[PDB]
Amino acid sequence: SVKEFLAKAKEDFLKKWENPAQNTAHLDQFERIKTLGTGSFGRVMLVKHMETGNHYAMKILDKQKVVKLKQIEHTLNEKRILQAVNFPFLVKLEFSFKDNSNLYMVMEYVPGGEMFSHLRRIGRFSEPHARFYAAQIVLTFEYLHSLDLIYRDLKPENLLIDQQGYIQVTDFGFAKRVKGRTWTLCGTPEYLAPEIILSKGYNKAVDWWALGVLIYEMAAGYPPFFADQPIQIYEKIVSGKVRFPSHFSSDLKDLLRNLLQVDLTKRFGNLKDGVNDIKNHKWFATTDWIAIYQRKVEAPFIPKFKGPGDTSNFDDYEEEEIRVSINEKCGKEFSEF
């Protein structure tokens, strides 16, 4: 039945993957409100769709900055994948378009803010609170990996909390459809699997290692490998010596030792039983997988919302005005967008 759900999900994905939606809106249909978060190529802004009165989160990418940073293929991967996927824990892409200067991805607005903000403020999540979030990541990865997709950017910063206290995965800038091994050095220092640091060819198992880092960070309040400089973080990861807080349950530690396994022949998610080694682990015994997918499990935390268009669950960012050049930039590089 999971097999049946997945096969049908694949048929749906493939049709959109092979025939992508393109130029489904225009910049002047949206009222720009405030910056929700930033990046190397632009920003993610709270916008209002005038025709419907709906609020959205619009990702703006400067084509020239994308080209300079050699992120062309990664950008085309992000939009092509996002428009083709459909899962309760994946942010919906409502519209995409481009102009002379920029690329635009209009997504569902997630008002609850980043998991990152709530985790840093509160300090750490209890094991049932962490388990609730981890279960949603486990299902999301089971879905993505079945479609030959590697996510490659798991971290609390990319996990948004909706009105129901459920996760919405955002930022697909490193997502890639790959049947075999891949080599691009990308991700976040704290979340990188040793295979990535060691310039080896790697596969989906890097997402399962990143899941180990996420579960550890949510339950400890800090990641398993941290230092002031990324080179020092990399030395810690490749040794893979993990120390656990005294408050971590024996089951939590056992799950984490299997997830933060430097040996790929031993890493959970990577074995012959695949995701089932994770889903059947003792730490997940109380998890009802179907109820998680159906959103019927009550969330341990429901964010505050002072109506539609409120941004208080997000930090404030310096505003930069959108300038659209008279001349088309990087036309050929982004023709398929």
């Binding site: 978060g37 050095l185 220092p189 704290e190 800090y222 941290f226 230092a227 807080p245």
Partner: peptide
């Protein structure tokens, strides 16, 4: 404590992605 070492580190804010 590990918490005090983390809190005093320069890596408690939003972490940037790395590439190429």
């Amino acid at each position: 404590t590990t918490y005090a070492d983390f809190i005093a580190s320069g890596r408690t804010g939003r972490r940037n992605a790395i590439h190429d």
